[PDB]
Amino acid sequence: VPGAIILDTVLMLSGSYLFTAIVGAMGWGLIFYPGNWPIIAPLHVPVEYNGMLMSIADIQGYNYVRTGTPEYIRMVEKGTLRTFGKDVAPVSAFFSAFMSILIYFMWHFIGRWFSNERFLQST
Amino acid sequence: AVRSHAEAVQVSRTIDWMALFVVFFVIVGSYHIHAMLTMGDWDFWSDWKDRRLWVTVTPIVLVTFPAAVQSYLWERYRLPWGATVCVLGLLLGEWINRYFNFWGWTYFPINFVFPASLVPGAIILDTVLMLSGSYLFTAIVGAMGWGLIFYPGNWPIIAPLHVPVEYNGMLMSIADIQGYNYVRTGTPEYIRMVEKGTLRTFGKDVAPVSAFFSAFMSILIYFMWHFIGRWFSNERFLQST
Amino acid sequence: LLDKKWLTFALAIYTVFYLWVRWYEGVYGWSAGLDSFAPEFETYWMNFLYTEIVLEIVTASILWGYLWKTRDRNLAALTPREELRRNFTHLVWLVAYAWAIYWGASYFTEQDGTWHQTIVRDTDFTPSHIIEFYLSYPIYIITGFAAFIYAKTRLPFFAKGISLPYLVLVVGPFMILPNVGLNEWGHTFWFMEELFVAPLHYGFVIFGWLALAVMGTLTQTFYSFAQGGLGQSLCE
Amino acid sequence: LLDKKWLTFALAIYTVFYLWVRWYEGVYGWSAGLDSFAPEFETYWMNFLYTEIVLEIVTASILWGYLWKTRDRNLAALTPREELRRNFTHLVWLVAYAWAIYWGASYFTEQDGTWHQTIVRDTDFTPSHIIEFYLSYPIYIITGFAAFIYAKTRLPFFAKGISLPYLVLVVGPFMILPNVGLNEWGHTFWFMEELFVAPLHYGFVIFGWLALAVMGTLTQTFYSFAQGGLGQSLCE
Amino acid sequence: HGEKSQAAFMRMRTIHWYDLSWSKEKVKINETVEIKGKFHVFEGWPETVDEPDVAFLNVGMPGPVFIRKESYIGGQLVPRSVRLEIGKTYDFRVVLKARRPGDWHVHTMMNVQGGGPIIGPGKWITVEGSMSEFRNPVTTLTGQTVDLENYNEGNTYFWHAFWFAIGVAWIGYWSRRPIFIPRLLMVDAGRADELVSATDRKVAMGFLAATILIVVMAMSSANSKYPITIPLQAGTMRGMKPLELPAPTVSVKVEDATYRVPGRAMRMKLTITNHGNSPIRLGEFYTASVRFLDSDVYKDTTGYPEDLLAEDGLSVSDNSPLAPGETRTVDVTASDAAWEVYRLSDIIYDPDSRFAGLLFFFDATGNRQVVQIDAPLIPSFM
Amino acid sequence: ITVEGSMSEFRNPVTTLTGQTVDLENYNEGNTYFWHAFWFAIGVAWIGYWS
Amino acid sequence: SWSKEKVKINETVEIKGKFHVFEGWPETVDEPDVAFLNVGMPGPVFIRKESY
């Protein structure tokens, strides 16, 4: 909802569709992680689980058995030799904001076609 | 309007100079960033200038801007130097950077970090454009010229760097010794996409086959980028962006 | 009058400032500028990042606001001589913008290429990243938007309608700045090597293409010149 | 009269039937519904598949045939009140279609997501696959085609020409049903894991996009309303 | 200088450098400084990092302030990428020739195909002299001693300048006449077909023919001169010889390991069991470029960097000599300022709080055994 | 494997490193519900303002 | 070792021997994780009856 509200307000204010795709898309990408941080913050509390450090979310995933979803399918942050400092969340947020700009620009025109009122006489 | 016809001519000359500046340096920026983020690695070093990947990739990614700029310039002004101005702009940017950043800021030797030569391809593209103004004929023949003359065009420069040397028990060319000695902290040897030999490499054909593949893909990229440039030449006015 | 010596200042300010920036990075690239966590690096380069960002935001706001407040409302009452003078001033703005494009997208971009190609990346705000992504990119973004506002508010041709190619020319190179996120998301993630032709860099490539809109920009400016300052002499 | 209580029945039939289907799958999901080769599974779920397919084919044939046989030939002789009543009946058809879209493409689709994400897939006709691919998908396909036939045969606006956006809205969600083959060709082949964001699922994604044609559908229906039932009152 | 940014657990478990020795600390231009030692490729290699199937032994210096004259893994020169086996120990010897004066932090880094750089310990090496004094003579197989610093530079400059001059002439030929607005108006207002006419087409044919002939003649001349040429040498060197270390006689089992947050100390508990017939004493704990030494057991004589050395940063609860066959549980505390200077304490931020390192157990006679430890690293907040 | 009893009797206590024994069955459920409902309420208000 | 040098139609010629997979395998060539033992003849002038 924070991303939706930013997108809609930055749309109506400054009705420029380009300005919306440029600024509201940044808002949508950037406010995702801070928007969900209050909910997933309690789930990231460190816990030592039978000798291994685990967050609460890791313990839930380990305990509650997902028969079809093993641990290795999890595309999560596994750490890199190129991860400098504490920047995983902000860099990912900015990449998501930029790609949101691009996807907004593409889907604005895709929606412009779906709004068509044409009548093919012989489909 | 203007006072006299002579002042009109002088004003036109001033406008021509300033707009030539704009074209030249906007191309210098955009074309250089495109090239360096599509062919920079083979262009940065002398031990990357192999006979498969370098000559395969460089013309393909470097006919992009000349095609569009020619499509605009020839169509609008009958000026057959769009490809040449793009190529000289890229060369000027690369050489300024090699001398003042590669060799000025750091101290990598120029004979190690020299760029690739592209003026023969540019001249072929422009002459085959103006002669036989057919854009299709240009995309078919001038693109072959651009792809095919890349390796022979750079052969005088990189020929001295391919002289065999035995280096502490291993055969090495001069370019290999430069790449081995001059330490590139961020560029190890394995990143080098060079000719490593194949079990399907028949006879002495690595350079010519790669050159012909590059010429063909240059035909395709020229055809695509001619129309991409045709859009960038638009003079539309969206009333409500 | 017509074209004044504003062109000389427009080129000279960029040349002097960028030569000073190059000297600064050539002095503090190493030895307070090599290690991103040393106490001196924060005093020599983290301060560069903060001062330049604040100054750029302030300057962009002031320049765009001034150029939009001093806009000419009575565009119908425009003598052809004054229209041609404004056309020349707009062409000076475009020359300054092109100089900024060069300095930002060729010089400092390949300077960053050399930087991270000959050292190991240590942070998202390395010396050359600060110099290129956060200084030169915002500078030419500011200049491009200022030239856009000037053309739209002064030139009768560019008014009454937002120019599509010239908008693309002002915005595409601007989208390179938010594309810096993909650059860092690329090196930290998918490209764990200093490969400089890998797809993480295609983001700048796509918007490097959008700077080709200078072709439509310059034919539109020629058309603008050919209304009042048409002559004649040309075509006779 | 105008809008009658057909809307209440249109929503209620879907709600009651789908709550009963959810109860059925919540009772027989396990314990005759876990193992696809047990003798009881064929009696509880293979019978579900056969009865529902036969009933759906019969109902589609009967509904489309009736709506096409009772088509109004004399569309010129149509009073504006009757045209507005038919417009409201068509909007009720669209409301029923939207309810079916929701029930088929959100509820049972993510129910199948839970199903195969928390068990191991045993066949192409698992309980939730039977409930979603072969029940809910054909139900909203039937409703969409019925609404198409009704609009084309009753509404003067939608007659004399096949509406492109509304055709897309009726057909795109229909193409999801033959796209079930890619779903199974995906899990048995290329995606040997229960990954639910993998490209084998992009088939439903592409035709999930085609349901965006409801935008053109609803602006076209508004235009149809604004011929006879234009008022006025609006725009005055 | 590239470290302190990588993931702490990743620096802890990729590659362990030990026995490092720098031949010189204050080198002159052209004088040779050699880095030796042994690096152990960790068994529990992180899965996010591609295995060292194609690894290149590099050196981390700012630019080419030292030219890498020679570099060996095992006993053979490795100028190209090599394949390393996980769990093996290799010894390297990098020969560096000074080129640029100043204080240079020469790190021994290792690059993996799909895992990035592994920077090892770096030592401040001072160089005195002038860059112009640097000489790099190499003798080719055709019988010509060429200096790599200036070889081919003149030919490169000449050919690039000649092609640029040709391009500038081609542009200026049209720049002489008016360029933009007159030509645009001629094209717009009806057929132009006068902006390109003889002898402009003759000049075009001249330029095209000159370009083709110049390229062909230059290629033929560059084939007569330099008649012997070879392609760029490439290909991974498989079959590196790994060190045949004896099996350690000491087995260490890590029963939990903690570190205070925030803090500079690492607490860890071991059950050392000594086999053989000698009394061992734990003397050193090398975790990630940082050596925690026990002053009572071992003192460094190899000139390790001061910022990477803990002379008495290792404190063992019970460091009495351990009789053979005996097993005991001790609390080992490695506390040093380097643990926060090199940001080893930011393993809390990492998505895998697991550590790895080398423990060096020394005997009375002086010989040592290198034993490996790896266990989860649990932070402590109370 | 047969299980007897009631699901409501199930207890899953886990002790975090910060010194709080939390039951995984209900931990963070209230905060999740509150934040999701608050954001949904904001969205519904935003839609209803034009509705 | 080739069993026969002058074979008749339907008669069996057998090729035996040992092949050693080189340790220093070129990196450009994928390791023989999936290798098929074939025979190089112009078309099927010999049918491969057996291969071990």
Ligand SMILES: CCCCCCCCCCCC(=O)OC[C@H](COP(=O)(O)OCC[N+](C)(C)C)OC(=O)CCCCCCCCCCC
């Ligand atoms: C109001 C005007 C002045 C401020 C302007 C902003 C300057 C930067 C502030 C950093 C704060 C901080 O926290 O640092 C940044 C933290 C790192 O974490 P750290 O622990 O600080 O690491 C210490 C690192 N050093 C020592 C180098 C500081 O995350 C990041 O790497 C964020 C990376 C974002 C990359 C993508 C950006 C794309 C921008 C697109 C624009 C259209």
Ligand SMILES: CCCCCCCCCCCC(=O)OC[C@H](COP(=O)(O)OCC[N+](C)(C)C)OC(=O)CCCCCCCCCCC
């Ligand atoms: C329209 C644009 C509106 C922008 C609104 C910004 C709200 C404030 C965000 C604080 C983030 C934070 O607290 O720091 C960054 C953290 C991640 O940190 P982490 O490394 O995972 O550490 C986790 C531990 N924490 C929680 C103690 C830190 O959150 C994020 O991932 C958000 C990254 C993008 C933030 C962009 C801010 C810069 C201005 C952008 C617009 C020009």
Ligand SMILES: CCCCCCCCCCCC(=O)OC[C@H](COP(=O)(O)OCC[N+](C)(C)C)OC(=O)CCCCCCCCCCC
């Ligand atoms: C508009 C089209 C104009 C064409 C102009 C051709 C100029 C002459 C080229 C000589 C090449 C050479 O000398 O042989 C091939 C060599 C590579 O050889 P290598 O195996 O690497 O050996 C290296 C050792 N050398 C230098 C002793 C040989 O160079 C090339 O890679 C160029 C490959 C493409 C050549 C195309 C020629 C056929 C006609 C094409 C148009 C129909």
Ligand SMILES: CCCCCCCCCCCC(=O)OC[C@H](COP(=O)(O)OCC[N+](C)(C)C)OC(=O)CCCCCCCCCCC
């Ligand atoms: C419609 C298109 C017709 C094109 C006809 C080709 C004319 C060739 C001109 C002389 C080139 C030359 O002499 O160059 C030959 C070199 C050989 O390379 P090399 O052996 O590695 O070393 C260099 C050895 N020298 C120094 C002795 C040359 O380069 C090439 O590989 C180009 C030859 C392959 C061309 C295949 C064209 C097929 C056309 C099919 C449609 C009819």
Ligand SMILES: CCCCCCCCCCCC(=O)OC[C@H](COP(=O)(O)OCC[N+](C)(C)C)OC(=O)CCCCCCCCCCC
């Ligand atoms: C489009 C709008 C663009 C706005 C960009 C603003 C960037 C400003 C530079 C920040 C540098 C930094 O690192 O921060 C501030 C630095 C920190 O250096 P110091 O440690 O104090 O050393 C003493 C300073 N020296 C090392 C430069 C001698 O000091 C300063 O005050 C100096 C900043 C001078 C900037 C103005 C001169 C520019 C050249 C002349 C032609 C214009």
Ligand SMILES: CCCCCCCCCCCC(=O)OC[C@H](COP(=O)(O)OCC[N+](C)(C)C)OC(=O)CCCCCCCCCCC
């Ligand atoms: C034209 C675009 C201009 C944008 C200017 C940025 C304004 C920043 C506002 C405050 C954000 C904040 O305070 O957030 C900082 C956090 C840091 O994250 P952290 O260290 O992981 O933990 C959280 C630590 N706290 C709780 C102490 C914050 O998030 C970020 O990484 C955002 C900072 C990087 C922004 C890079 C922008 C580059 C712009 C280049 C063009 C001039």
Ligand SMILES: CCCCCCCCCCCC(=O)OC[C@H](COP(=O)(O)OCC[N+](C)(C)C)OC(=O)CCCCCCCCCCC
């Ligand atoms: C609506 C359309 C928008 C879609 C775009 C969304 C972004 C996709 C995110 C991918 C995450 C994923 O899917 O998986 C993540 C995978 C998992 O690989 P790994 O096992 O960690 O490999 C380990 C190798 N490291 C250590 C180097 C990571 O990492 C990848 O290979 C990243 C692939 C790049 C995808 C991003 C391309 C963006 C295009 C930019 C050109 C302008």
Ligand SMILES: CCCCCCCCCCCC(=O)OC[C@H](COP(=O)(O)OCC[N+](C)(C)C)OC(=O)CCCCCCCCCCC
């Ligand atoms: C667009 C057109 C859609 C057509 C779809 C038709 C699907 C029919 C269901 C097949 C179920 C099955 O599994 O098969 C038939 C089942 C097999 O169950 P049983 O073992 O006999 O147990 C006894 C049956 N109980 C377990 C349900 C009690 O029995 C039946 O006869 C019952 C089918 C009842 C369907 C009609 C009620 C729907 C809810 C009320 C609002 C409409």
Ligand SMILES: CCCCCCCCCCCC(=O)OC[C@H](COP(=O)(O)OCC[N+](C)(C)C)OC(=O)CCCCCCCCCCC
């Ligand atoms: C005339 C109306 C009533 C019949 C309607 C059809 C119901 C299914 C009949 C199965 C017969 C059979 O043979 O089963 C199916 C055989 C399996 O082999 P099996 O040995 O039977 O395995 C026993 C398996 N059980 C115990 C679960 C039955 O192949 C298949 O998995 C076919 C899979 C097709 C997947 C893609 C379908 C896409 C549809 C697109 C629509 C636009």
Ligand SMILES: CCCCCCCCCCCC(=O)OC[C@H](COP(=O)(O)OCC[N+](C)(C)C)OC(=O)CCCCCCCCCCC
């Ligand atoms: C005219 C254009 C139409 C082309 C489409 C034709 C279908 C292609 C069939 C591929 C067969 C092949 O080429 O090879 C088959 C390869 C061989 O891999 P394997 O060694 O068995 O891997 C073993 C891994 N398993 C065990 C999981 C298989 O399996 C594949 O990787 C399948 C790749 C997916 C391709 C299908 C994508 C369809 C796009 C749908 C989005 C709407």
Ligand SMILES: CCCCCCCCCC(=O)OC[C@H](COP(=O)(O)OCC[N+](C)(C)C)OC(=O)CCCCCCCCC
């Ligand atoms: C997944 C991609 C999204 C689908 C969107 C593609 C739509 C393409 C547009 C289209 O269908 O053109 C229709 C023409 C037939 O024309 P006519 O029937 O003569 O109609 C006259 C007016 N018109 C020419 C403008 C249509 O061409 C024809 O031959 C009729 C084919 C109509 C099929 C369109 C239905 C699409 C449903 C998926």
Ligand SMILES: CCCCCCCCCC(=O)OC[C@H](COP(=O)(O)OCC[N+](C)(C)C)OC(=O)CCCCCCCCC
């Ligand atoms: C990376 C891809 C390259 C970008 C090129 C895409 C350009 C697409 C063309 C376009 O923008 O159409 C503008 C229309 C709005 O129209 P109007 O503002 O009504 O203008 C009337 C005349 N016109 C309809 C022909 C434009 O559609 C709109 O809603 C306005 C959006 C304008 C955004 C274009 C700016 C592109 C900058 C990146």
Ligand SMILES: CCCCCCCCCC(=O)OC[C@H](COP(=O)(O)OCC[N+](C)(C)C)OC(=O)CCCCCCCCC
């Ligand atoms: C670091 C920040 C420096 C900002 C410099 C801004 C200079 C002032 C801009 C400006 O108003 O234009 C200056 C000149 C001459 O145009 P003016 O005649 O002043 O424009 C107003 C027109 N009007 C009299 C009809 C109302 O027009 C030009 O062409 C000015 C180009 C000068 C270089 C631009 C540098 C921009 C860097 C961000």
Ligand SMILES: CCCCCCCCCC(=O)OC[C@H](COP(=O)(O)OCC[N+](C)(C)C)OC(=O)CCCCCCCCC
């Ligand atoms: C499980 C199968 C159930 C099928 C239910 C079909 C009900 C009969 C359809 C029908 O004819 O329309 C019913 C209503 C009212 O429209 P009518 O006035 O009956 O349509 C005829 C128009 N005419 C008098 C001018 C000739 O129009 C509507 O809007 C009916 C919507 C009711 C819900 C549709 C459920 C479809 C499930 C496949």
Ligand SMILES: CCCCCC(=O)OC[C@H](COP(=O)(O)OCC[N+](C)(C)C)OC(=O)CCCCC
């Ligand atoms: C068209 C772009 C020109 C770029 C020239 C450049 O980067 O100059 C810096 C470089 C620096 O090398 P150097 O001149 O030796 O002076 C060194 C001073 N630092 C280290 C601060 C750059 O050389 C100059 O300053 C020459 C002046 C050219 C004026 C157009």
Ligand SMILES: CCCCCC(=O)OC[C@H](COP(=O)(O)OCC[N+](C)(C)C)OC(=O)CCCCC
């Ligand atoms: C807008 C979609 C509503 C979906 C509600 C649903 O799936 O209901 C089934 C679920 C089943 O849980 P419960 O109510 O405890 O009854 C269990 C009966 N079975 C196991 C057959 C579902 O709860 C209800 O039946 C509540 C009635 C809501 C009416 C809109």
